C-alpha cells in the first residue's frame, strides 16, 4: 500500500517543539528503506530495534513525532535524559522502542532576521510525562503574589522563541527531528514488513 | 517559593532573552566593523539602544530580590552582576552631564592633533603620525617639542573637564553603596561569600603593592641597562646618577618599551629570529596560518573549530571596497557563532597574533556552556593571559621547527635566548611599573588623599618613585597629563594588564611543568601535551562561575598573585643583567635637579 514516510519527512512546514506533531501511520506496507533517501542525517539512534532488522516484524501502530530543536538539544531526545526539552516540551519513555532520526535544516527553517515562528517552553509548574503535550499560553508565577492575569513583574510568559538564523553554530542550528515509536499492543497488527 | 527559588526563573528568562538580544547587537556590531556604512551605523545604534533599554529594565526588575537571603553562589554572582545601578543612581541632569563629559572627552582624544610646528598647515595626526615620530626618532629637541605640544594642547582642554568627571564619578560611586570610583573598579577582583577563598579591595591594593616590591629588582636592573644603552646615542641629555627622560621611552607615554629594541640590542652581530621571508617563501596565504594554528590547538588537546567560523569570520583583507577596521578581535556573538575578524598579513607577528586572538575564542568556546552573566573571565585578566600563553607557546623556536617554519640545521644558543628574553621583557615588565603607578594615582585621586589643587604634582612625584623617569619639561598644575591615555580619558580600568602578566606567567609555569619539560622556562610548549591541555581546560570551562581565587588555584596551586613564575621565566636574563651591570651605577633617585 506504499506506507508514506514522506509527509512526515518531506514536509514544507515542520512544527515547534512545544506543539509537536504525531501521525498514527497504520494499515500499510512499511517500506522503511524509503527513509534512507535523505543523506545528511545527523543522528540515527535506534533504541530497542536493530537498525537493519526493521522490516521483518509487525506492529499495531507506529508514531512519527515531528518537531524542530537546536543541535545541542538533540541529545535530550533519548530515554532517561533530562534537561530543558526532555522534561518540559517532549518527554519520551524509558521503555522506548523506536528511532531518533534527526537531520539538519539550517537552509529551510532559519532566516537572517529570525525564525520566531518556532517556539520552546521554558517554564512549567511540573515536569512532563512520556508523550504528553502542553499547548498553553498561561502566564507563569514565580512570586507568591497573584498576578491578576497578564502581568510583568514576577509574572513571565512561559514560551521563549528559538529565533534561528543561518549564522549559528552546529549546536544552535535548527534540527528537524522525526522520532519513530513502534507500539506492540496485543492487537491484530496492521503494519508489516515486505517479504517474498 | 523562596527568594532564591524565584530568582532562578528570573535569571533563566533573562539569560535566554538577553542571549537573543546580545546576538542581534553583536551581529550588528560585526557587520558595522567589517563594512563601514551609514545603514550599518543606524542598525548598530538601534541594536545597542534596544540592548541597553533591556538591560536597564531587567536591572530594575532585578533590584527586587535582596542578596542577603540568597544562599546559592552562582545565582548570587549573577544577581550581583545584574543588580548594579551603574550611572542611573544619579539624577537625570547629572547622568546627562556625565555622558556628555565622556563623549566630548572621547572625541577630544580621538580627533585632537597638534598644529604647533611652523604654520598650521603641518598638523600630524596622533594615530599615523605622532606614534611614528615617537617610535623612531633620535632627536632630543624634536621629541621634546612633540611631547610638550601634545600634553599641553590636549591636557589644557582635558583638565577642567577632568575635575568635573572625577567629581561625578566619585558621586555616582558613593551613591552606589561603594566608597570611591577606585573602590568600584576594585570590585571586579572581589570575592565575598566563600570560606577560605575570600578577597577584599584593600587586600587588592596590598597584594599589588607587595608583588611590585618583589618585582622591583628586575625592573631596576632593566632600568639601569636601558639607561646605560641610551647614554650612547643621546649625549649630555641624561645623568649617570640615575633616571632618563619620559619622552624617550619608545611610546609617547612610557607604556611599552618595545620600540627601544633597535637601540637596546643585546648582541648586534646575532640578528633576532625572523621568519617572514620563510613564511612568504612557501605561499602560506591567509588561511594556512589559521589552519596550522588550529592544528597546534588540537595538538594541545583543545577541540576543533566549527564550520560556521571559517565561512563567517573575516580573516583576509576586505579590499579597496567594503571599508573596515583592521584591528584583530575574537568575536563571540553569542549563540554558537564564533568569528575572528582580522586582516592577516604575511608576518610572524600576525602568526602569533592569530594564535593570541584565537586563545580568546578557545576561552569563548570553553565557557559557552555557562549562564549568560558568567560568560567571561573570572576577572578581567584571565582572557588576555590565556591568549598570551598560547602566543608564548607558539613563539618558541622548537614549535616553529616542528610546524616547518625553521630549518633543522639552525641551532639555538645562549645569545639568542638572551635576545629573545630581553625582547619579551621590554614588553612585559616595562608596563608593570607604569600600570601600577597609574592605577595607584587614579585610586588615590578618586579616594581623596590627593588634593585637587595638587594633582599633576603627584604624577611626576609618584613617577619619580615608581617608574623613575624625569619630566621632560617642568609641567605646572594647569594640566591633566594622566589623561591623554586612551584608558583614562575613555574611563577604562588599567590594572587588567598587571593582573594579566602576573597570571600569564603563572599559567605558563604551571602548564609547561605538567607537560614534562626539563630545562629553561622560556622554551616551554604545550604542543603534543594533553596533560596540560586538560589542566588548562579545567580553568577555561569555569568562566566567572567559580571565584578567581579558586580558578587560579585549579591550575597553579596558589590562590593569589605571584611574581615568582615571572622572575623564574625571566631568570636566564636576570642573571645576565646582574653580570653586566657592574661598571655602572644602578637604581634611581630624585638627586636630579634642573
Ligand atoms: C520532496 O519535496 C520537494 C519539494 O520541492 C520535491 O522537489 C522532491 O521531489 C520531494 N522528494 C521526493 C523523494 O518526493
Ligand atoms: C557593504 O556595504 C556596501 C555599501 O553600499 C554594500 O554593497 C553592502 O551593504 C555591503 N557589501 C558587501 C559586499 O559586503
Ligand atoms: C546553585 O544551583 C545550581 C542549579 O543549576 C546547582 O547546580 C548548584 O550546585 C547550586 N550551587 C551550589 C553551591 O550548590
Ligand atoms: C578535527 O580534528 C581532527 C584531529 O583530531 C582533524 O581531522 C582536523 O583537525 C579536524 N577535522 C576537520 C574535518 O578539519
Ligand atoms: C607534535 O606531533 C606531530 C605529530 O607527530 C609532529 O609532527 C610534531 O613535530 C610534534 N611537535 C612537537 C613540538 O613535538
Residue numbers in the entry:
A (entry chain B): 334 to 529
B (entry chain A): 19 to 612
Per the authors:
Since late 2022, XBB* variants, especially XBB.1.5 and other XBB derivatives with a proline on residue 486 (486P) on the receptor-binding domain (RBD) of the virus Spike glycoprotein (S) started to dominate, which demonstrated enhanced binding to human ACE2 while maintaining extremely strong capability of evading humoral immunity. Interestingly, L455 and F456 are two adjacent residues on the receptor-binding motif (RBM) of SARS-CoV-2 RBD, and the variant is just the “flipping” of the two residues, L455-F456 to F455-L456, also known as the “FLip” mutant. These two sites are also located on a critical epitope that targeted by the public IGHV3-53/3-66 Class 1 NAbs. L455F caused strong affinity reduction on XBB.1.5, but significantly improved the hACE2-binding affinity of XBB.1.5+F456L. Both L455 and F456 are on the core of the RBD-hACE2 interface, forming a compact conformation with D30 and K31 on ACE2.
To validate the hypothesis, we constructed recombinant RBD subunits of XBB.1.5, XBB.1.5+L455F, XBB.1.5+F456L, and XBB.1.5+L455F+F456L (“FLip”), and determined their binding affinities to hACE2 by surface plasmon resonance (SPR) assays. The dissociation equilibrium constants (KD) demonstrate 6.4 nM, 25 nM, 11 nM, and 2.0 nM for the four mutants, respectively. As we expected, all three spike trimers mainly showed two ‘RBD-open’ and one ‘RBD-closed’ conformations with one or two ACE2 bound. To further reveal the impacts of mutations of residues 455 and 456 on the interface, we determined the high-resolution structures of these three variants’ RBD in complex with ACE2 at resolution of 3.3 Å, 3.0 Å, and 3.0 Å, respectively. With an unambiguous electron density observed, reliable analyses of the interaction interface can be performed. In contrast, the distances between Q493 and H34 in XBB.1.5 and XBB.1.5+F456L are only 4.78 Å and 4.86 Å, respectively, indicating very weak interactions.
